[PDB]
Amino acid sequence: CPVEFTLDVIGGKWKGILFYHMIDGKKRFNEFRRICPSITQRMLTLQLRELEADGIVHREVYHQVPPKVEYSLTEFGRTLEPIVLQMKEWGESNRD
Amino acid sequence: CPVEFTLDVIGGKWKGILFYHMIDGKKRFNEFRRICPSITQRMLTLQLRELEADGIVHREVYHQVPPKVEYSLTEFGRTLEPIVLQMKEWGESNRDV
Incomplete structure (x- = not known):
């Protein structure tokens, strides 16, 4: 637990x-939509809201016209990196 | 992906x-219900069915009275172990709540 x-x-x-x-x-x-496009505009947002709410991701709004929002991994969020990289390495090995 | x-x-x-x-x-x-009890009888079954379907878990029925069903990690399922152990080590370090 x-x-x-x-x-x-x-x-x-x-x-x-x-x-x-x-x-x-x-x-x-929109960079996320191009990548794994299966995800809905809605879902993408919910995830990013949650990740952000858990302090993993940092949302930054840029004072410009039009305004521009960019997402990025907080220092904390980086501590989950090794896991996530291993999830990747395993999914690659074990394809079927 | x-x-x-x-x-x-x-x-x-x-x-x-x-x-x-x-x-x-x-x-x-029932050992699972005692552990993280928040899970419903239904949900538990669906997970175990899925894990089992993905070849992670092995379900074994014991010829006895009453019969006894015991779950365990297949050899394959063990390959996810390091990940899972790290999930644990991280959740322990980073305890907020």
């Missing part, structure tokens, strides 16, 4: 994928 | 917990 804490935060279909893409740099909303 | 494969298999609220408890040995249904 201490694994639960982590799984709430990072478990769940998408959280892992989203997170993975921010590892190598910040990302706008 | 290669993290997806893994997350289908092992992501989701419970799969990780359930799994964790089979690491150190097989378990009956």
Whole structure:
């Protein structure tokens, strides 16, 4: 049940994928849609809201016209990295 | 989307917990309810059915009276272990709540 804490935060279909893409740099909303396009505009937001609410992701709004929102991994969120990278390495090995 | 494969298999609220408890040995249904009791009889079954369907968990029926069903991690299911153990180590370090 201490694994639960982590799984709430990072478990769940998408959280892992989203997170993975921010590892190598910040990302706008629409960059996520191009990547794993199966996700609905709604769902994407819910995840990013949750990740953000758990202090994993940092949402930054840029004072410009039009305004520009960019997402990126907080320092804390980075501590989930090793896990997430291992999730990736395993999914790759074990394809069928 | 290669993290997806893994997350289908092992992501989701419970799969990780359930799994964790089979690491150190097989378990009956009711042993799971006592552990993280928040799960409904129904949900527990769906997870175990799915884990089992994904070849992670092995369900074994014992020829006895009454009969006794015991769950355990297949050899394959063990390959997700490191991940799960790390999920644990992180949730322990980073205790907020």
